[PDB]
Design a protein around this ligand. Structure first.
Ligand SMILES: Cc1cc2nc3c(=O)[nH]c(=O)nc-3n(C[C@H](O)[C@H](O)[C@H](O)COP(=O)(O)OP(=O)(O)OC[C@H]3O[C@@H](n4cnc5c(N)ncnc54)[C@H](O)[C@@H]3O)c2cc1C
Ligand SMILES: NC(=O)c1cccnc1
Ligand SMILES: [Mg+2]
Length: 309
């Protein structure tokens, strides 16, 4: 039924690891695999990178790894490159179920001249292309792990978790959902509701869709999954279908779940948040509620979890 994971001593630590490796002495990890997650119509490549850390850089679900790309710091001669953070997309056991690997979900940052569409190697994103250009056996300078905002609250195994992602913001939720549904973790038997909302540009830009869809058939009473394909669908007002439009489609259900104590999570590019806030204010107003009052309450109750950049 559930997949055996090892070693179960990874459940014993009472606190998440933080800054085990630091930039001046990173951990030299080894690439296991790199693959594209997306199809030909996707605006850009997003890749799935599996990294062998040998058990030397454990983490909890929701944390980030740092990666120091090669080369000198362009603004600090003689110095290494600045760390880039990546949300870990794997559980603490990893994609090999052995506690030795972790995975990243990385969008290639590529520069196009806004008029001609021409390229320029010196303007592409350094660390994202480094990662998606990697091959098995390549070495990676790893730092961290870091972050606590997106730790999964496990005190109540029957909690409700409403997960709102755009693009690579799905990464921590892939980790959450594997821990909730896929892996045999005897000390955490999830029996609540986990509701994943994912916005991407088009069907070819979907990330891990087969995995999430499988949870609908395995855990129909504990998982829901809704997608917004912005260039392929339009909202009720003529706009491109964004994730906030999908929340709006379920406004009454979601607001009732929040009032009942649900956690809600937001992850991805910071550009996703203004439209979400606009939708939530409009929804609140139609219900005769104040979104300001409601958000202040959610934050005070520690139901509101945002990590965007
Ligand atoms: C907590 C956290 C978690 C994150 N999680 C993820 C994740 O899971 N996945 C993910 O893909 N990203 C994630 N990010 C973003 C990630 O950390 C990087 O910032 C991103 O990958 C870009 O880094 P880079 O080294 O590729 O680009 P950089 O080399 O830092 O360049 C940044 C941008 O500037 C552009 N640029 C460079 N030079 C020029 C120029 N001369 N003219 C115009 N433009 C230029 C680049 O093309 C790029 O878009 C996260 C960020 C944070 C803070
Ligand atoms: N955790 C983050 O801030 C994040 C994740 C994915 C993409 N961009 C930022
Ligand atoms: Mg696909």
């Amino acid at each position: 039924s559930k997949v055996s994971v090892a070693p179960l001593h990874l459940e014993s630590a009472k606190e998440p690891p933080l800054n085990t490796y630091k930039p001046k002495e990173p951990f030299t990890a080894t690439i296991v695999s790199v693959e594209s997650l997306v199809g030909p119509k996707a605006p850009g490549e997003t890749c799935h990178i599996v990294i062998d850390h040998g058990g030397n850089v454990p983490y909890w679900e929701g944390q980030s790894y740092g990666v120091i790309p090669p080369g000198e710091n362009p603004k600090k001669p003689g110095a290494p490159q600045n760390v880039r953070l990546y949300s870990i997309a794997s559980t603490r056991y990893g994609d090999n179920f052995d506690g030795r690997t972790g995975s990243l979900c990385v969008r290639r940052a590529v520069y196009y001249d806004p008029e001609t569409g021409k390229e320029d190697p010196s303007k592409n994103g350094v660390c994202s292309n480094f990662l998606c250009n990697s091959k098995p056996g390549d070495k990676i300078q790893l730092t961290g792990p870091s972050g606590k905002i997106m730790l999964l609250p496990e005190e109540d195994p029957n909690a409700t978790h409403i997960m709102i992602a755009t693009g690579t913001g799905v990464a921590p939720f892939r980790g959450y959902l594997r821990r909730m549904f896929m892996e045999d973790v005897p000390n955490y038997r999830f029996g609540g509701l986990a509701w994943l909302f994912l916005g991407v540009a088009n069907s070819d830009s979907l990330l891990y869709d087969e995995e999430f869809t499988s949870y609908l058939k395995q855990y129909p009473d504990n998982f829901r999954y809704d997608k917004a394909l912005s260039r392929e669908q339009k909202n009720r007002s003529g706009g491109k279908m964004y994730v906030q439009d999908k929340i709006e489609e379920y406004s009454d259900e979601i607001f009732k779940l929040l009032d009942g104590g649900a956690h809600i999570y937001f992850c991805g590019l910071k550009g996703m948040m203004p439209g979400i806030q606009d939708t939530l204010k409009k929804v609140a107003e139609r219900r005769g509620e104040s979104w300001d009052q409601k958000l202040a309450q959610l934050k005070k109750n520690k139901q509101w979890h945002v990590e965007v950049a």
